[PDB]
Point group: C3
Chain length 131, copies 3
């Protein structure tokens, strides 16, 4: 149709620790399957947790073929929290589509944390034009 | 008009405890008042808190006539926190409108928590098409 | 173009304490540079922290020429946390453009907190119509 909404959602990912950004499997939009204008991209990870022994947390990024375009993180406020609580995370970025063929979510450990998704997470994009 | 933006906002809700998803009163979009294509729905509860004595928290869901389409939660990282801090929460889901007549926000207790909204919260939807 | 996506992003702001809402520098959309219909506005501050000695936190607002349209906050759950963890924050509001010429992000201290952004934050708007 004429006003594309793109969405990918997952409910889990294998638990991993990574020093560097690695794809969150399943959070991937094939944009080439839009060639001009803009995409407002939301990465929504509403119920993540991190396990670790040095102020755990998770960095998240939005990436295209051109690499990371935006990132951010949550961290706990204790070195070893009593419980690794669920720390809702959302990241919003707008990309110029004019060598972008895909958008994806990525994550990376804070201080060696293991990264946990065990429920709904999504990557969404709304197509628009420049002003 | 030709590119509908839907929005509902509230500033409070009666405090309740619920084992199961119950509507957050006022976060409701009448979609039937769109019949094809997609809605990107955001549930934004930026300043909630939970009270309780067993690692309190709140689950939130986006639901249509067809039930819950996405959910997630925040939880505290202490069994009884010193203070029940404000834990911003956002949830994003894209729905195929092709027996959807309404979208609403819902919530449910984590471990018997009382659920508190006492400031701005919103439910938003942007209409688009399949790709 | 015919379906404008507006975006502004920053990676830092001078650290300040404020009793009242002050602009977050750089999170500003010139809307007048749209005169009818709606804007869905997202303020995304994914990696803020607050420093303070009385349950620190940050309030955030979306404002237009007409003032604040929505706000919310995060707060820590300890009076003086062991570490001031990163507390992702998102705020979503829909505005009727019919004396709006700009949209901006603002912030304000919780209990005298110093306010910290030292990585990506964004303010985004998608143009639509009434239903
Ligand atoms: C409070 C806490 O951290 N509990 C951990 C247990 O996690 C809970 O497990 C039960 C099933 O027995 C439920 O699945 C519950 O949803 C789990 O709690 C959720 O996840 C944890 C990690 C926290 O984020 C909590 O706030 C959230 O509600 C866990 O099964 C055990 C062993 O792995 O550790 C407990 O500390
Ligand atoms: C630190 C704390 O939890 N304070 C609680 C009190 O809540 C504050 O009340 C004052 C008015 O006296 C303000 O309204 C302030 O905004 C309230 O704090 C906010 O809400 C609490 C629940 C926390 O989320 C806090 O971080 C947030 O800023 C509360 O009135 C009393 C009794 O109910 O308990 C205090 O612990
Ligand atoms: C755990 C913690 O709070 N550490 C604080 C230090 O902040 C870390 O500094 C290192 C560089 O040495 C990195 O830049 C790291 O990313 C910083 O941690 C990040 O920011 C702090 C404020 C927390 O939000 C943390 O969770 C987050 O990962 C800081 O440099 C020093 C002195 O200012 O204080 C430490 O407590």
């Amino acid at each position: 149709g004429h006003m594309p909404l793109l969405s990918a959602s997952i409910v889990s990912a294998p638990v991993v620790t990574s020093e560097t950004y690695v794809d969150i499997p399943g959070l991937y939009l094939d944009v080439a399957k839009i060639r001009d204008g803009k995409l407002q991209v939301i990465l929504n990870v509403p119920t993540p947790y991190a396990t670790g022994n040095n102020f755990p947390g998770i960095y998240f990024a939005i990436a295209t073929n051109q690499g990371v375009v935006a990132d951010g993180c949550f961290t706990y406020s204790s070195k070893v929290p009593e419980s690794t609580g669920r720390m809702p995370f959302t990241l919003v970025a707008t990309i110029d589509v004019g060598g972008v063929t895909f958008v994806k979510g990525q994550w990376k450990s804070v201080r060696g944390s293991a990264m946990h998704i065990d429920s709904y997470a999504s990557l969404s994009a709304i197509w628009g034009t420049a002003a």
